[model samples]
Target: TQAVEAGEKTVEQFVQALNKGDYNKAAEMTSKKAANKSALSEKEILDKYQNIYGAADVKGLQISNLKVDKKDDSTYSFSYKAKMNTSLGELKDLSYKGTLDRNDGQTTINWQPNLVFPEMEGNDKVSLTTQEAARGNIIDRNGEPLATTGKLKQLGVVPSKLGDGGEKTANIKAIASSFDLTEDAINQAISQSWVQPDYFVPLKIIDGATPELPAGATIQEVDGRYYPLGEAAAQLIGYVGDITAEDIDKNPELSSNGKIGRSGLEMAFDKDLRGTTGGKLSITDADGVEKKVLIEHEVQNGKDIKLTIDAKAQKTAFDSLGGKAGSTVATTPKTGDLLALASSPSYDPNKMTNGISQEDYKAYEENPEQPFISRFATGYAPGSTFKMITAAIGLDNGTIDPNEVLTINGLKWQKDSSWGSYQVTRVSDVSQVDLKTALIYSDNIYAAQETLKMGEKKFRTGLDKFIFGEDLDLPISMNPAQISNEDSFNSDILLADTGYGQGELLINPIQQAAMYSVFANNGTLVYPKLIADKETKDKKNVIGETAVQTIVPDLREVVQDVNGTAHSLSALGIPLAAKTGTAEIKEKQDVKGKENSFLFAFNPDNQGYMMVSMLENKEDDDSATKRASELLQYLNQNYQ
Candidate 1:
């Protein structure tokens, strides 16, 4: 008997093509409405099915052993068993049933809202229970914790309690000052719409700090966070906090309740620090309130993280600040292992871990000395530190002759500049300066003249190879050093300023160290990294970019040379070479009388210890270079 041909082939054809793993071909079989009428685009619609059907691997793909038959006049019933993997765990042996209807002459899978997944629509809910990996640790190269789990005190004040204690609270001012809280911070937290009078209103989280408070004020022990090295590693170590609603909103994949890193290394290593959030995924109402348990995943803590920081070295570098508002970065030239990263005036990580009051933050921001900012990651005018970059590029570009001597007359050289005719300063009064002498005395005229000889286009071309204007690949936030070029760097005078390390040449302490490392590592700019796990996994990631030769010896002469900028370091008994710079502040009113100082010094010990110091010094202060020399000497002695 000949069976009449019906529209059964449409549904069967789609399924057969889907079974062959031909997603594109199967997608064509779908009705245009099923492909487009929903809120999702055609590509998005295809993606939803691709998640379920495209992958053939057992872990990635799930399928129903499709065995379908007729149910009624227009409807057909089907049963397909399924399995799908989720963050929570593997979901297996699920029964799925979908309906197909023949309308007129065409057959289509009856487009139910639940067609994406049988239970995916309406009241159905999805959740991921993470077996969170260990919240990663930030450790030194030798694996000492910079930020580790420890107990902390959360200070709070009850609105009603503060009400009665009022003027008699002698410790109120002290408490406020300790947290750097203003009257408004206390009042605002207490009077906020979310606060209740009887509730314990938080004044602040004080890490490893105990200040006397009135009996009304409260201190509670919580699994907050701890900075083991305190202010010595505060800004770089950063802090963590209770995951806020906003954080969850920012990362929708965030678990139900988790901790989030706030800033510094804590924020930078947050992904590795925030291990898999193991929990349960359930089907629930839209509010995500009423739920049905479905999947359960054992908690996996975050992966432990190690930093390039060497704890003892970090202490030395931090203490090296000696109340000077500045920053320092020390690294191994070959591997770019950060021996120490320090910034000042450093804040207490304990106080910051809990949270800083807006009032306090505002004050810190307004202060002449930026306390909370990480200066190692921020850029400043490079000053004479730029001379090395200029000299290196000049020689490579044929603009500078190693033997060519250009006379640098007088203690000051006045020249027409892009910012207007400028009078530039010189520490050396010499009749002539060559390549070695130019770096030796930090002769700006020689540098500017050589750069002009290199010409703007050629100078920038060579500088580009050294990564000028390009941001280094770093886990943390850092400002990139920008070099002016012919395209954006117009005007010969401004180009001349760039040649001498003035104008808009801005560089970070970390990057300045990297710049010098390029010369130290046999001209190879070995990549710098802070994450130890990442470095360990791929040694290549830490290798820097590009290579040029003979310049390292040039850098050595800058310190070893008789009249070199860092020749002063020779008195410290540390075998080192470096460049010194004092940068002028052209903008801003807060630091009107202040200038920045820099020194990029590397060791001759072949232990590859290199350091960069950027200090906020008073005008005419040379303490930064002198201190850097002392620091290197101190480190050399302590380690030996």
Candidate 2:
């Protein structure tokens, strides 16, 4: 009876250890007979248990209906009902039978591989075969593909067609050049053990245009991911790749054969875009035969995503950047439909999806202009483009009058000597400046003086009306717009600089475009929308119509007036309100620094579209203004 009691206690401890994932502790509870028969140490037991748990993705195990019967004075037969959860589903009511041995009042379980599963033998194997779900496609508003499942050309060779001696050598070189591989690599592919004289031997994937093949070379189609818009939508649509080991560890639903979204919208909606991975887990005999089925599941393909992006607009925006390092964001003002989010210096997603050569990857990595960066989502100083927000704030708060003309002394002025040499400077020599003249000429001195008159408190309060320091309700990642590094300004000079879009003022092209929506939407900021079916969020009334009424006419003059900064766009014959900015990046006020150009434009027709284009390190000051004019001209010619 004492031996029977001890045996029952040992069985309970073993079950508890198994449930707790204490493989080492459970192995210790086994008898020497099980260890010798299985040739397993405590370490070996730990490894086996872990492998089974990971392979099955087992969790939440529970044992019930345990029964013990005396076999002899020192041994007892035991049985238990086992149930557990796996990746596929819950497996329940598994019957397990084993014996516990007792000697000198110590009890231990007689373990075997069968203890892991009902019918598993010592040489039996547990394996899981995964079925990869088909990844989904991303489409534009018109149902055109952005990222899609397509085919890529695989260039290979038939060894028999390669002529003998020098002819063979010449063919190899031609194939090498076409495939962009070394001659030795081509030879090695043909020399593979499984390659036959008449069989096709795969060498490389054709990433670009199909090349003229050699005598022995041929092209075959292989399933792959394709990006039709290529570099234009690279950062917006992103790409996919084979899942890594670390990826599987983090997400048990993923398998070795599955692909995962790597960046952009692909990464943002990976859960919906990647879908679920299904598998068949079973026990097989040592002779490579399936013995019993454990768990089976069907693959669920990812869902297709549709966006408000216009492929033509995206391409036009990217091309209009002129291969410069910059970004462009365009949207319909009333509907808030995001038409384009283009970033220059982009990589080809098709090449990135299938594969990329080390040399090409290194070139991208080493290039001074980083192609991997998504400039549309990155923040920059708004420069004079921010003058609109300042003007709107001043007008709404009654700090600035439309007709109040100030006789400014010169192009530069400071508040007082206590300001310690810092001065606000403007491009024009216009001494008498009002709201309209300041906007038309983009006079930083006027902006700074009005902002100082409003003081930091009222300006900060007015800025709070616009979207800032918040997560966007879209898929793309962005650094939130900020007035300054802290919640408040540290100095009056910093506040003055911020009024003209400098001194820690930062806004991304997307945010800038959305802000411009106020001009067309009657002083309300329309939330940018990406998904074609999603409803727009509530709009923010940033300023009163009184301010809008006063500013709209002045902004219109910014294009119509011959002396306006964006005056070139007026020649396009479209009624447009626009603003241009030239932001200086430097460590000190007096030192010369790199300049970035910005342009924000929209139809003054009560709502059509708005665009914000920014060019980094401009060769000429008017580059952004000129490029913006070209974009609007193209839109007027094609999109309208």
Candidate 3:
């Protein structure tokens, strides 16, 4: 580049004067006659020049493609592309334009640009595109349609085209009433027109009125997502809602047309279930009307998923619960297959498929039982059902001899001295009872003695070996089972209380049932499984596996002995063994009741089936016993 020094000053000299903080000298470099003509002082002139030219702390600089032009006698403009190296990085090819004025002996430079920095010489900009909706199907294990999508006719309005008159207000009111929108809502939409033109403003109207003609309103046919199941599995299936500003900020790739899973399995498996979206392009004329140029890319459908659940069993269990506040989980003791799992007060998942009404959503949110939450994962006191653990610990640690007899003279522990008490005889018919008889009668004294003998450490350690206080590796993920911690092993009072399934010890019904599987299988702990096998894109069977197995040398006599708790089942023509548990739960006097009236049973004759039933808050012993008997009868009838 040629250095055209119109003011007899080099760029280096001008830069050096500024670097040394010599404002007068820098101003003097400008044209002398021009400097005198300006009203500002030398310092003010330099300051004004610096304001337009900007300061530069340069280690090195390069100027290229410089061009200069004289706009007037005292002022001229120049352009150049420059590159500067800084500690941050290399700034390349920066373009600048500036003006110069001649004042006195000074020549001042004022720089500007035709466009922003790094101006592109030609058209090299990129444009963004929109994506189309992806397709997917939801079906049952039997290949029955659960949810599918289809294209539907949609109505839209151009408020600008609606002529002003009483007719417009009446039309708006009519549309609002037809589409189930409030009159106030329609008024809000109309209020937007007070400013500039608002076109394509979607009136809150659908599934009802057709767009009116001549008012510029038109109905267009568009592909819309639909759910066929209505509300069958609304919570589990979830729904899609309009994208919000926060969502766009978080996921910039997302657009207004994109849909997102808001809950349940849809949200849980969004990546695998949401398919790829495509786009289409069509040209528009100068009037913004559609033209003939067309392009489209078809969307790919999402992959299907299968779940492990028995529909029949699920329905039966749900029906049995009768919309009550309770839960049920059934599994095979040997193979650990979850046959049925139900929580009452369930909501139709279909309601969430599209969108739920705000009022209905509020009702669900305020439901005390939280029907939306899967209660199988919730924990409750095992009550006497936990005696299975105490019994196992006693047997394993040799704390209580299986054959030794215990005399239960009812010396019930009473917290208050003034309270009246009753006693059962130690030498009575129940006096010389073994472990089997003790469990059958659910004798508090006998259980307490056995637990005291086992001690806390041995009991806790034995239970821990059986996966108690550990994360249970069931096929369906659940919260970890918890066991109350004991500070020391010699806490006899606490041990005695826990021995009979009371005090601080607690366990989930599922865990309690799982614990009994060991006794049923001759000392084997089974890992509970939920999904057996997936048959269709939507359905699956519950799978099972034996987690651990060991031989209980003393288990045979408990099932066969005349005095055994479960020997009655064997004599009744069914060779099954089990233990029954009932423990009182404290509450307000009116609310106090028994929880966990549970029975764990299995038949040696049947290789695959095991059963457990726990009736919560069944204050009546007869009701608990009857439920157990009915469950047993059902299993015996079905398994055979």
Candidate 4:
């Protein structure tokens, strides 16, 4: 009775060992010598198991419905069904049959290669073939490629072809100078155990031009990521790079040879754009003939994404920057579809993805002008562009009249003597000023007095009509618009400065563009959008139609009238509603500070697009105003 139980226990131990990945224990329970089979040591058996299962990435091994039948006093027949999960897929319900020998109190399995897989024998090999999924492209509204798949020249070297001594040394030096590499690094690659003398070892991927190489060096074409718009769209499209150890830890499915998105839209949509890997696992005979297919998985390619960006508009906006440090944002006021997001002094994303040298990267890092910074994603003082909001708030709260004139003394004014020497100044010194004259002249004193008339509490409630201190629903990363550093203003001077788009007020180009939509879309704020397929958010009613109508005509006067601050753009031939502002950055009340100029404009008739342009640290120039004119001119010429 105990003899049958002992045999069953022996079979159970072998199956458990396989499940635990302890092949050595399985070998121990198996006989070193068996009928009609060659002898195999425990080490040999362990090595064989590791090689097959490791290549398959196998796990979750299970053996079910194992049966044992005693045919005679010493022979027992065994049968079982097997299953396991692997990278390629699952290998399931594989039926295996074998025998166990029992003599006296001892029990041992008769091991053979067929037990691992049906029909497997000596000299047969298990092979896994991998297929990498193709990465998707980033496209614009007009079907133009933003980022896509392409090819680049990969430079490498073959040690055997380098000839001897002096010739080899010279070739190494030449390659180092051209590729920005070192001779020691080249020698170390040749010293790798897997590197064969005749094999080509890759050195670097070059983006722009092909350089001449020495005798042993060569160039090979390799798959790469491409950006067509170059610097014009660098901050929008981003780039991809090799996966790091941290990335592997987060996603075990990723391979070491693959790349991952690093910034902008690329980083935001990485999961959908990287796709999934697929492969096949099978057994092959010594002659390389396939014995049986174990598992196969079809590769899943990445999804292509279309954006609301217009390539021509984006390029025109970028060109208008003229290599200055600034940002320009354009959007469809009614639909909320973003048109152009341009940031100047930007680096080439292609160079970043291909093979950028350390020296070149350091140059970007240390350059006086930060070429890597995304101006469109950062917040700045809105300057006079913020005047429209102040005027609208005053009109809505019944604190201001469009036709009534106020008598202001001079170019500068202070509320009372109790207040120190702090004063609010205006560019024009007109004694009689109304809402229309104040807007056309871009007068800071007028904006400040209007806000003081409504007081801080009413103005804060009006400011709440627009978004602030919250992240945008857009895919691109950016800072939120802010009213002040605190919820309440501690002093009237801070409130006064804020009314004219100064003090602690900061708004990114995109937010500024969206806020301007209220004027174009009948006092409703249209939510900005980047991805083309995303549903448009319902417009939020910010101000009343009466307030919008009262303020828009004056804004139109800011462009059409001769004394208007933005009169420079009146030459565009098209009727444009515009507001221009200049914010002065200062350490103290009396000290001179750097200037940031702005222009917020749109076509009043068509309601086609609303734009916000900002130029940083321009002390004595109207470059920002000129840029706005140039971009608007381009849009009218091409699209209209």
Candidate 5:
């Protein structure tokens, strides 16, 4: 009241209070009614400036150009500007203009909704809400989309909207013919007695085609998730589903989308594939049409993820499995790019993208061989396919000599009693077994003796380099195959059993492919790559690339040796290196058990892609070697 310019002085003091977040002091300058609108006590008003300041995510609050003038003796008017930072991208000089009254030697400032922000208020204020955004695309090495969303149409009917023409049954039959659905299907959809008569009952999928419309029928557009390759890449592309509470807990920001990645690559690169979600802020009139926007940001589609999977090669491998409970994987040894990962018994991912019935889910869950598990990502006994590493172990440790002739004489390999009463036996027998001879026949005696000479330290240490026990480093969930060397290195019987791949040995197909790939790439191993196109977001590399020892010349004999187990390919007129394997999932040495077959090979002719195939739960007649050979032929014939 005493200041020469009370209006200007009050404005400065008011801003100073706000700058210090001192809403109590700021409240004192506000009129009695205005302060009452926000305060329980002077102490209660302390956070009044905090809400606006905090929401804007600002600092350095200030006031300038404080102009105070008088209209009359008891009237005061003022205009000043305050600037602060905002989270919506900038601090665009938020300003205020108002009138103050002076009566009975007291001054009170006017109250307005724009007091905090340019157009912010409780009933009409800035707000944030997210729009539906594309969850990016999962593309193949050819830059073709594999898993994505596309437009589709559904034919539906509102029985009431059909009217009482009494031609409703005829109308339903017309729709049935258009969609190839049984007439009863349409009747069932419309007969949902509990649903409202006005509700549009979905009768059948229209597939975006312009089918003839029957009475009361209308076509509605919808987003239909699709996997172009269908069952061929079902487990690989996976699917999406409604967000669960657990998904929300993992990412509260995903609340608006209502959907999240459920499995496979969808789950692996989920967040990045979902991209940045954006929203808006607006003030609308009670009529809900008048709107004033203060801030807005665009919803961005997620980054398109790319993979090295060869769809053609993948299909070929899937065909090779031929609906058996088996799996196959192919990768380029030189670049570590995965070509294909095929698993049989795979169901169409599109079937349950919405949600599967509990009954159907229970059946899949109870199946002996899990249909959902990606067998390439799962582990199985390496069988004779593990010979390369066993021989590598022998040669690197100087336990076996190439020129030294050894004797198996027959299929039986009698282990000393200290080792085990069970003998190490091969399906075939050989004489004068040397490195080349033993590998050619996959001689159990030769491999067992080689591992025995190392005692334990050398063999166990050697397998560590092979990366057993640890699962392949993939973006999705991959469980370790449950093999350990740390505790069993000193056990002779276990070593003897492990030498030729038996007795609780489990090696995932991906790992075996990578290991055999090392031999082809001059003994260098790298993390097998599935995500391709040089697309990565602080994740795995295609090949940062490992070398065990320089032993390619010895392995060359593995394919070129006339008697080599895989040397059978010489007549095929293709330079192919390979190893064949079969393991018996025995039932207590009494019942005739199921045999699982396996093969790991590398093409010397074309791209030198390393491949692994396993026909799981095969009968005595099924051959992993035959399926694996077929897949190899497929690679050289098609891959660029």
Candidate 6:
């Protein structure tokens, strides 16, 4: 007789006693807590399982061998070998070792399966012992150390050194007060002293050099990570933290003492940035105190990282923003080298490296302005900056005529019911307006009419080609580009709104600046590169390989002509093309009644160099224009 009937088969037989499938009998076989608890019936549950697993054509099971060993009245041990026959063929054999417990007629099988049947002879697991230390240094593009590892003398109390007559509390109190430790903290350290070994390194009261140590205390030099650049590039460089519980669950190999990157480049290049840990074999007694060093292996430091950011440009952009909200990205369009990338409200990375005080971290977290988040990563409304993408779309779809004259009536919306009110007159009232003039004056009506003519499918297809709403696949990791669209731009109102960089369209400044690079580099789209070639002491160098080279071949002259919007700005003695945008955002105290100003420009004479600047919610057009003009002057004087 079979020792146990299958749960489903036993239920099936009970249901067979009734008509085809009795719902009540099936419910009876289920536990009282689970019977009919769900909306699905027993047949439906079985059918769903069959649909998922059985559809793969898994057939029947074959019992190869079985062995039983009686342990006691309540328990017995058993081992079995079985094979599963599928539609494809017979699967590898499986071996299961288990103990069955029977208590008051209820049976439970504690099963452990040896899934690796073909190689089940012996266990071969390798164990490694290694020393834990603070991570090493991180350097900038010019080999300037951004973060460094420091040696700190840490002090720990030895129980044997403290006499039993309340001397331990007195000694710990004296040392803790000198180090600025709280009374409660010192008391707690003393209370847990018994849990840790006599030589265990438990306390790190002072990070720097300490003049004195407590009686009966041992001192050890521990490694600590430090950042010297305060908070200038904290978000980009990221921070390290102790290994978390979640990390252990996901990767069992991870050690609790190891540090993990919490964000930015530190996280992006963690594999290369984290060096191999060295091991030291030392004899330890039952109390876990190291007696002697037996064998040692040296640690391999992490590979150096070099970025394309110019220190001067970075500082300039930060100062120009003047504590306002905005971002700036400058790159060499020809080589995809990042000249400078800056975001405001940056925190000092060193604070995080050494461990941010609770008060400081809380103050940063509670601030209305989120300094921790990189503003460049958070996208903004493209506003008039979107006109460039629209122009590109028009060119690709053959719907744009650079020379053709378009009449505008200054109407924000059309008058008719089908056309809606654009508040502008017919073509004759604003007659003889060409693309060049349209861009110069930023004519919203003209752009709307052109968009309406192109339709949605063509517009979307063209935008995708420009990478408006996609990942840039840039040299360095970047935040994904964002693009917003309306349900339809078929109507005159919608078209006009979209034409002037409003009404259902939006993009980020990074994408806008990158798009303009096509014009500067003779229609070739250069991938944005952040890291330059790295050089060593012997002058051996490692350089990044070029990835993409897309050439547009049509936008070159259109961006540099006398009648072009950028023509007036080209008077600065450098061959340059540019477009300015005045985008409106929600009213805020800093901005008052201003608009977000954006400028995308490139120097064609140099065959590269694209600069993008935006002042978020400035007070007036003059402020925006003045900022753009100053930025242009700087570019012309320095980069040229």
TM-score of each model, in listed order: 0.70, 0.85, 0.55, 0.75, 0.72, 0.60
Backbone clashes in model 4, listed as residue pairs? 384-581
Q: Give a tens-digit lDDT track for model 1, residues 1-640.
A: 0111233455456556554446566555444454322333445556655654322111333565765677677666555676655444466777666656565566556443344444666444444334444566677778777777766677888766664565624445555776667755666666789888788877766655676776447898777566788888888888777776556534534443566777887787787777665666655566777465666656666777777788987887888778678888887767777778898887777766666667666776787777878888887777777887777777665667778888777876645443454666677788877777777777787887787778878877766665456667677687677764235577667777888787776777777777667666555566566766555211221222222344455666767777677777777766666777777775456656567777777765564678888778543544577677556875566443
User: Please, what are the lDDT tens digits per residue for candidate 2 over residues 1-640?
Assistant: 6566777788888878877778889988877744433336667777878898878777666888888888876678889899877656678889998877776558777777888888987778898877777888899999999988888888889999998899999999888886678987888778979988899887777767888988999899989788889999999988888888777656656655767889999888888877776888899998779999988878899999999998889998998887888889888877788899999889988778776767788887887768889999998988888988999999989999989998888888999998887789898999889999999999999999899999999999999888888677888888788889999897989999999998897888888777778888888888889999999774667887888888888989999998998898887898788888888888364476778998888877646778888888677644677887666865555433
Instruction: Write model 6 residue lDDT over 258-304, tens digit each, in one string.
Output: 77777777777665666654565333433555544433556656676
lDDT of 5 by residue, 532-589 (tens): 7542211122111221332344444656777665665555566666777767777554
lDDT of 3 by residue, 6-64 (tens): 53243445545644446567666443334223334456656643542232212244566
C-alpha lDDT (0 to 100) for residue 333 of candidate 1: 69
Model 1: which ten-residue window has the lowest total lDDT? 536-545
Candidate lDDT scores, in order, read: 0.66, 0.83, 0.52, 0.83, 0.68, 0.54
Which sequence of candidate numbers ranks them by TM-score, best first? Answer: 2, 4, 5, 1, 6, 3
TM-score of 4: 0.75
Q: What residue runs in model 3 are displaced by over 4 Å at the alpha carbon?
A: 1-266, 276-300, 411-432, 472-477, 486-490, 531-576, 586-596, 618-640
For model 6, the superposed segments whose C-alpha errors exceed 4 Å read: 1-129, 133-140, 146-229, 242-255, 276-300, 355-359, 396-398, 409-432, 474-491, 531-573, 586-594, 621-625, 628-640
**Model 4 error, position 491 (Å):** 2.1
Give candidate 6's TM-score.
Answer: 0.60
The regions of model 2 sitting more than 4 angstroms off are: 1-29, 34-127, 157-165, 176-204, 207-211, 283-293, 587-592, 634-640
Q: Candidate 4: which stretches are off by over 4 Å?
A: 1-128, 153-219, 280-296, 586-592, 638-640
